[PDB]
Amino acid sequence: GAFNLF
Amino acid sequence: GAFNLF
Amino acid sequence: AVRGNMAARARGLGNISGNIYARSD
Amino acid sequence: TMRTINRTLSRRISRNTGSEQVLNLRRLMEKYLEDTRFKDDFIFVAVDPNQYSVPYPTLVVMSGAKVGDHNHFFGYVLPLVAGLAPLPRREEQGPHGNILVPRTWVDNLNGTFINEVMAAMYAAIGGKSNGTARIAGLAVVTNEITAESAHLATTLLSAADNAIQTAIEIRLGDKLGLPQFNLGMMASDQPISSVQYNTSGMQDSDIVGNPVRSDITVTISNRIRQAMSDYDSQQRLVATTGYIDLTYSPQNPTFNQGPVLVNGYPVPPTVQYQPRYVMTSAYPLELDAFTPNTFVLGLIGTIATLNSGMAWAQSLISNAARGIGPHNPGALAMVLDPEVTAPLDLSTQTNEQIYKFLQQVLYPSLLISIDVPEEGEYSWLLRMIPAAEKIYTGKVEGEVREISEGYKALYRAFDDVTLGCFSKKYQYGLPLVYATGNRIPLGHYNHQDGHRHDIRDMDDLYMMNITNPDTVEAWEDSFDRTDMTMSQRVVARHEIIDRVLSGSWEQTGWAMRYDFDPLALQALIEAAADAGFTIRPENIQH
Amino acid sequence: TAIEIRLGDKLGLPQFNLGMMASDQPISSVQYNTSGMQDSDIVGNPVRSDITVTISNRIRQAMSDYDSQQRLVATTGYIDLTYSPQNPTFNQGPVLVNGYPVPPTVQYQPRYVMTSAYPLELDAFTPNTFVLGLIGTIATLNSGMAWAQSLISNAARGIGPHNPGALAMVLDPEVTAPLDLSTQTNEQIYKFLQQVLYPSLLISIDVPEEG
Amino acid sequence: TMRTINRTLSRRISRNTGSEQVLNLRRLMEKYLEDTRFKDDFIFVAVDPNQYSVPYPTLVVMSGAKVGDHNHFFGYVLPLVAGLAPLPRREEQGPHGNILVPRTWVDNLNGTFINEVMAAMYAAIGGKSNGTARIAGLAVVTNEITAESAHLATTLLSAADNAIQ
């Protein structure tokens, strides 16, 4: 999820 | 070379 | 079952081209 | 109820008052900038839970760029968590029942947090009609900030500036005329490389100040000679750190298959472990800018150096010289002969004897892997590797299936660094990156020599040397079994680490592990050679 | 606190009770540490802290889904032993613990001694808060024989002043040297302990004359 | 190309700024001398790569003596190398093939360096008609010089004075 967060 | 440098 | 990782063996990098190294002289 | 207990049952003098980290950090940054010529290029935005729905106090560093009549703004986010209680465990659902899963700081940064940060940024610049805003990076600061922390503030400001500038270049370089690094700029000079094997003492550190495992360090430089005066010098560009791990991988001859061939050669029947190289960090030395192309250059240099005459096995040979210890390769004697129950001491053997011993148990090849942090100084740069793992969007195709955007970005970087030779060497659409599915913790603990050490020191060799065989089986199983969910693997590894260390350690973050495709790497080396690039390692022995 | 206890009814001052923890989820944690620095008092003198228990409160945001905890109170202590032989020769019935008989070689009674208790994020500390700390400690220490983990953890260092292997001399008279148990598994050590210790715990406390 | 990479791919805030060892050392020496009676007996010459063909920043301590109507000047040379990258290895020719030979700081001090130092010294005193110049010694300083290094500066000045005398 962190990779696609921004 | 250092010995004869100067 | 059987223990171990079978895909890891196939992903090993063995050798690379010799043209990447600087030639002597 | 309990949130406002202090107001109900109050006392006049309190022992806990808290601190103002955002006020301290902002003051230091502005003080540093007040004397230079970039006073008006930065905007500082303070977000605190008292007015926005955020979990921690954060500071945002913003800067802008103008194309035509439009303004574009980019921000770098810094949550500060020193002095807060650590997160509790979360109960999840499993095939058998309920399990409690560990969490850390990054687990609270969800979509709501992003929406709130964006709203604060838009209020800072004036409104939606005054420009556009985007997030350029994120990093958690776990150490306290006081009035005597100028060095840390300067380093953080430099990191934010580099991230913002790189984002502007990637998004608007063609319209703004901004170039990027490629191998053609090293045409009139001689690149060189060097390697250092060190495992006793202090380790490398990150931007916050936490240790990083650095068993192997590789440096890429440039060699210069004055034409007339004959002076000699070198210019250091980039550095890389990592270590060597082992993966259990038995060969099955009884399945009526052909023998295992490595480089077209058969291996002895007793070989059952596969060496693996794990990259932990990469950073510039004298270069001001660090972009994805610079990362590709570092990768090429590391691959070329590590294969120069089996130079990676020197790490194990060097470790064998200390004798009995947590990194002794002599523990494989128990694997070779079942009766042997005690690790062997190899400190009185010559190098060739140790090499011959290793040849009976290890595959003669190397696997290239990398750890990608979920947040950190360079996570914005390294997130491109996970993005290229999915080659195809399943979108309906008139004839040929559509290809995803992350794959396109990684392929384009590889092709642009080598001036267009990678495209001729490698087919468009073949795999570049595989996912292993393992979530790795990040943290540190207190070593017996008086220093703090990386928690990644616990690996297979550590378990072989320190614990009993049941623990070794459990550790390997959580790394390899395919019928285990991610949370189950996390729980198993956490339990083992906690038992070994007696609970005396601290966790700071998470990371995921990926590995490269060997065919793609071979094509990349060949393409780099075809563009006129050569390298001369300077430290390789034998 | 003195003003509250003496004049709360006339001054309208409330006091802590378990009804204030109705809409949340209490949790607890325990740490076994015996190497290095110890806990300290207000003046700065060390306090023995073999076992530490922390009582907290768990919070979740309704819409934003954030997770946090709030730490209330802490407690420290250690484990001691008391000689207490069983006399079968007096024509009495066998000793029963939880209705179960014990092996004839058992002769020592484990004891827990509380050394300190103090608040963490609470501003006020009253007798009711002390009762909450006591309840939490008792619940945690009996969760699956969690107190014996202290002795098992101490056994991992080997020969030393806190080695439980010294009870081998009690078990067999001929043995004259304490035993080293650092190469045994946890269940083996548990089985060894079951031959010499009563399977129950005594709760005690040290009350300072000033402090 | 690669020498000017930072100017091409530039950033606003830089983590490496460098230091001014020659300015720090000269300031300490002059501060020590300002109270004694030998204020006018010494001349300090700064040579830096930005204007002379030298490999390292150096400082020269000069003093003179007069016989008859002629002036004679002697100098002591101090290259400062703290904070620079170490020298790479040089490839040489052997009976069998090529070998890589280690080098250190002194290997870069050749005849070109001596000629440049002499030219700087002559520009300091006024010209060839104002006297004669000779080199009296040389030493490499491998440790950093800060604003709290008075003892080291005094010791170096004493060594230079003894050599010149």
Residue numbers in the entry:
A (entry chain C), B (entry chain L): 626 to 631
C (entry chain B): 591 to 615
D (entry chain A): 45 to 586
E (entry chain D): 210 to 420
F (entry chain J): 45 to 209
What does the study report here?
In response, one family of large bacteriophages uses a nucleus-like compartment to protect its replicating genomes by excluding host defence factors. Here we find that the bacteriophage nuclear shell assembles primarily from one protein, which we name chimallin (ChmA). Combining cryo-electron tomography of nuclear shells in bacteriophage-infected cells and cryo-electron microscopy of a minimal chimallin compartment in vitro, we show that chimallin self-assembles as a flexible sheet into closed micrometre-scale compartments. We find that the shell is primarily composed of a single protein, chimallin, which self-assembles through its extended N and C termini into a closed compartment.
Cryo-EM analysis of the 1.75 MDa assemblies revealed cubic particles approximately 22 nm in diameter, paralleling those formed by 201phi2-1 chimallin. We obtained a 4.2 Å-resolution structure of the overall Goslar chimallin assembly, and used a similar localized reconstruction procedure as for the 201phi2-1 chimallin to obtain a 2.6 Å-resolution structure of the Goslar chimallin tetramer, and a 2.3 Å-resolution structure of a single protomer. Overall, Goslar chimallin shows high structural homology to 201phi2-1 chimallin despite the low overall sequence identity, with a Cɑ r.m.s.d. of 1.8 Å within a protomer and 4.8 Å over an entire C4-symmetric tetramer. We performed cryoFIB–ET on E. coli cells infected with Goslar at mid-infection, followed by subtomogram analysis of phage nuclei. The resulting approximately 30 Å-resolution reconstruction showed high overall similarity to the structure of the 201phi2-1 nuclear shell, with a square grid of 11.5 × 11.5 nm units.
